[PDB]
Design a protein around this ligand. Structure first.
Ligand code: A2G
Ligand code: MG
Ligand code: MG
Ligand code: MG
Ligand code: MG
Ligand code: MG
Ligand code: MG
Ligand code: MG
Ligand code: MG
Ligand code: MG
Ligand code: MG
Ligand code: MG
Ligand code: MG
Ligand code: MG
Ligand code: MG
Ligand code: MG
Ligand code: MG
Ligand code: MG
Ligand code: MG
Ligand code: MG
Ligand code: MG
Ligand code: MG
Ligand code: MG
Ligand code: MG
Ligand code: MG
Ligand code: MG
Ligand code: MG
Ligand code: MG
Ligand code: MG
Ligand code: MG
Ligand code: MG
Ligand code: MG
Ligand code: MG
Ligand code: MG
Ligand code: MG
Ligand code: MG
Ligand code: MG
Ligand code: MG
Ligand code: MG
Ligand code: MG
Ligand code: MG
Lengths: 201, 144, 117, 19, 64
RNA sequence: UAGCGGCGAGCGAACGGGGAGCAGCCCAGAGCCUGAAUCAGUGUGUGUGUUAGUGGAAGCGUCUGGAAAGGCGCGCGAUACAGGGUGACAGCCCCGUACACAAAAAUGCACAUGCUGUGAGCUCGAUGAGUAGGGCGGGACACGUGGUAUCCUGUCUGAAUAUGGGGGGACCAUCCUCCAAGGCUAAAUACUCCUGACUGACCGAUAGUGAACCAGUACCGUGAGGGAAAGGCGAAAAGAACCCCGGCGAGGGGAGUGAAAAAGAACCUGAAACCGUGUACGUACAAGCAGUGGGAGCACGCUUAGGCGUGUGACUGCGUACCUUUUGUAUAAUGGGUCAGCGACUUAUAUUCUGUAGCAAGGUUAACCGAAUAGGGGAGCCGAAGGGAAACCGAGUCUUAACU
């Protein structure tokens, strides 16, 4: 299975097991959901009846008053009372099997090929760290929303794509499943494809 | 393939029980606990093995046996693990190098489990009447 | 993720209050009382879709009995007559013709007597 | 809502004793 | 936290190959003279835990 | 897990392995040589932080509107599209932001260099006694006195002190290993009253702190102590000149302001219970869960001049609320005056079963490393073999002298 380039008009060889396997939606879903869950901060709490500020004094005597029996002004039944099942800070992170993560990326990268969303180029850089230069290069290569993976994280290209919200620039080791789906197009350098293959196998 | 076109596999995500949310749900009111008694109560239920006061099974039956400390430092080696070792010679350190038995194991035994089909030198290991007949057959050697 | 119940709770109570329009006192104003009244209105409605079929047949038979006796025959014998004459015109239509076409009913009664005699 | 209930106050009549 | 084994149960039940549990018979501790040899002989070998009892045993021995 | 355990309820190691971090020294002493290593103050220079700050890009026309940041058109900046504000939603209006700069003065840290104290190195010697150990009583060790090692000591005792002594889980021998009865020592670890920045599938005024508000206040209590309620006019006060009724009132009606005053300060929205005014229909010979099925008449509105839609409902069939609890409730058993808001199967970690996904005789890593949701890390865990109390044997094994 041979990928084709647009800038140089050449052929780049790739593994059939990495860029030419069927889309395992169920597997990709689990990894995407796991990634979103990994992004959660999980920083919150409410006060149980134990934590709400006030005395343990029984508001009124058990019997004789003619009112519902009360034990604590902190009862969750009461206004200003505890939350019955007060939240604690949680870790929402999920375990993703190494093989289930790699198999998910393989499924995603394979879809990007068939949907013609993966563009392969020999070299992708700009002259100086100027957003105007990259912006111009993207309205020449004919894409607005795009994810750029490059071999060495060139400082100029990184800075030049920082103020463009629809454009993101990363290395081959910094690819994530969500970013390979979220972005309309993915523009990978020749070196990147020779780093991704070796990382997935 | 978009973030709003990904579905989980059919039946992979079953909706959890929500007790005490009305008649329609079928878990209304009592929330599947029934009427009254210890088991309907918050934190209600008897401990494991409790039979209602009747001398429980793990008490009316006698204790037996003792735990062997020697058993804990004795391991069994199958035949398929004789190929996994790096060298060809199956000593009581090469089995630890290749992670077949534990670091604390002082006694190992080769038994008839799997098919060994390579010449193997088993040294300082007890070997079964089927193992000595399977290793030697493939072209192996044994010494105490 | 805290959920306020106000908007949904309001919608549910209003839906019941709307079905309780025309009911007396608390039954058209007070949710607790209106809910019971709408359920009971429903129970009766379900019961009376069956009773309606009983009450209307009861009414048809009463009228056929009347218009047959004016022609000089009981209901019991008139229907027996029609069945022997192989007349399959149902009581709803008999009752309707007994009121609106007394000449046609007399014709049915004549066929009744003929089947008996 | 409801106000905090009163502590016991003098009672006019003894509860009848049934025994 | 980890479930705790009912240690008394662990001293009286061993898990077999197919998942059942072997146990020692009761009535062979003392008062042996009045008991027939046949009865005592049949009480010597280990027996399997019955179907009705398995649930109770498995609860007590989560790491069996 | 091994153990401990009215062997109950429960309690619960260690060895060893993987990591973070890593550092060793001094006195119990005399002499030689000299103050030579190094930690501490002490000023003095050097950088680099902190405590004020400085500069900081780029937009106009038109349409709707009270107002434009919105729509539409055509431009421009971007190492700056973090965020906030501005009469509705602004990269280019404002404050910022990226980025680049800044200290008279004080102070932190890290190097450099004088001063003061401190004493290295080498040779020879020394090697912590009411102590170890013991008896009695307790306590601590996962270990409840048990067969119970080991540690601590209230009480009574009491060694050997290197040719010696401690430990190796009763105890003895052998062997191995260590040197008590003197002391010092960074890092990895714990915590946040408090300070700055930043973040949230955290709350949004009965929530979130008790407290968004002059709240630990009002108020309660002799006192310790307890402890509320209460947020929002508008873009801008432009917060209503003046006139009129009224008590030189309250309150209101005009006028004027505003996009809006049914935004008028008792102010965004303005639900429900609850209370009224108006209109239509019913209702003063009529018995009960108040509805429901049938149904006349009247009023109103229509898109056949006609049926149909709406409101009412004479008369009539049927008909004893709801919840709870019960063998069974119209029950004269329980609970609810009504409305609105809140109010009850959760969370963590283990374990088992089901579904689903991956991989498959393999599967998977934990801590941790890594800026890395990657990658590394396979320490471990589960499985591929069982039988036996166990030694042990092993597709068998146990039982038994041996099994048909
Ligand atoms: C009132 O009742 C109380 C009990 O609650 C005492 O019995 C008291 O004595 C009573 N007083 C009278 C006057 O009967
Ligand atoms: Mg609260
Ligand atoms: Mg990992
Ligand atoms: Mg049910
Ligand atoms: Mg109940
Ligand atoms: Mg009961
Ligand atoms: Mg029950
Ligand atoms: Mg409780
Ligand atoms: Mg290992
Ligand atoms: Mg909310
Ligand atoms: Mg109403
Ligand atoms: Mg109330
Ligand atoms: Mg015995
Ligand atoms: Mg500026
Ligand atoms: Mg405009
Ligand atoms: Mg507005
Ligand atoms: Mg010493
Ligand atoms: Mg002592
Ligand atoms: Mg002793
Ligand atoms: Mg000692
Ligand atoms: Mg000893
Ligand atoms: Mg020993
Ligand atoms: Mg509050
Ligand atoms: Mg509000
Ligand atoms: Mg006071
Ligand atoms: Mg006035
Ligand atoms: Mg507003
Ligand atoms: Mg208002
Ligand atoms: Mg109202
Ligand atoms: Mg009348
Ligand atoms: Mg009368
Ligand atoms: Mg009456
Ligand atoms: Mg009736
Ligand atoms: Mg009863
Ligand atoms: Mg009844
Ligand atoms: Mg009764
Ligand atoms: Mg009642
Ligand atoms: Mg009554
Ligand atoms: Mg009761
Ligand atoms: Mg009551
Ligand atoms: Mg085994």
């Amino acid at each position: 299975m041979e990928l084709v380039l647009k800038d140089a008009q050449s052929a780049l060889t790739v593994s059939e097991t990495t860029f030419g396997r069927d889309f395992n939606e169920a597997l990709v879903h689990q990894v995407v959901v796991a990634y979103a869950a990994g992004a959660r901060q999980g920083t919150r709490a409410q006060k149980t009846r134990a934590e709400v500020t006030g005395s343990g004094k029984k508001p009124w005597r058990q019997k004789g008053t003619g009112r519902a029996r009360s034990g604590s002004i902190k009862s969750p039944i009461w206004r200003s009372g505890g939350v019955t099942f007060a939240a604690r800070p949680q870790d929402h992170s999920q375990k993703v099997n190494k093989k289930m993560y790699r198999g998910a990326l393989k499924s995603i990268l394979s879809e990007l090929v068939r949907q013609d969303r993966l563009i392969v180029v020999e070299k992708f850089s700009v002259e100086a760290p100027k957003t105007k230069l990259l912006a111009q290069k993207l309205k020449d290569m004919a894409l607005e929303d795009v994810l750029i993976i490059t071999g060495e994280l060139d400082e100029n290209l990184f800075l030049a794509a920082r103020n463009l919200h629809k454009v993101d620039v990363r290395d081959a080791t910094g690819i994530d499943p969500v970013s390979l789906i979220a972005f309309d197009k993915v523009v990978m350098t020749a070196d990147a494809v020779k780093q991704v293959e070796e990382m997935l196998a | 393939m978009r973030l709003n076109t990904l579905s989980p596999a059919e039946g992979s995500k079953k909706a959890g029980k929500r007790l005490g949310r009305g008649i329609g749900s079928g878990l209304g009111k009592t929330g599947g606990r029934g009427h009254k008694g210890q088991k309907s109560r918050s934190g209600g239920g008897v401990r494991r093995g409790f039979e209602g006061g009747q001398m429980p099974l793990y008490r009316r039956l006698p204790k037996f046996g003792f735990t062997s400390r020697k058993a804990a430092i004795t391991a069994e080696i199958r035949l398929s693990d004789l190929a996994k070792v790096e060298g060809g010679v199956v000593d009581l350190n090469t089995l630890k190098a290749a992670n077949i038995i534990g670091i604390q194991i002082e006694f190992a035994k080769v038994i008839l489990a799997g098919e060994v089909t390579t010449p193997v030198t088993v040294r300082g290991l007890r070997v079964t009447k089927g193992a000595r007949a399977a290793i030697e057959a493939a072209g192996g050697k044994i010494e105490e | 993720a805290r959920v306020k119940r106000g908007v949904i709770a309001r919608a549910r109570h209003k839906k019941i209050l709307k079905q309780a329009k025309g009911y007396y006192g608390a039954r058209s104003r007070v949710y607790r009382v209106a809910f019971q009244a709408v359920i009971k209105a429903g129970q009766y409605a379900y019961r009376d879709r069956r009773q309606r079929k009983r009450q209307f047949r009861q009414l048809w038979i009463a009228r056929i009995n009347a218009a047959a006796r004016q022609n000089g025959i009981s209901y019991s014998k008139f229907i027996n007559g029609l069945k022997k004459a192989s007349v399959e015109i149902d009581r709803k239509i008999l009752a309707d013709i007994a009121v609106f076409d007394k000449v046609a009913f007399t014709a049915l009664v004549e066929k009744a007597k003929a089947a008996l005699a | 809502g409801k106000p905090r209930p009163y502590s016991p106050r003098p009672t006019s009549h003894p509860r009848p004793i049934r025994v | 936290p980890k479930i705790k084994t009912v240690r008394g149960a662990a001293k009286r039940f061993k898990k077999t190959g197919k998942g059942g549990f072997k146990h020692k018979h009761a009535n062979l501790r003392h008062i042996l003279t009045k008991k027939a040899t046949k009865r005592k002989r049949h009480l010597r070998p280990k027996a399997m835990v019955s179907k009705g009892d398995l649930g109770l045993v498995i609860a007590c021995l989560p790491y069996a």
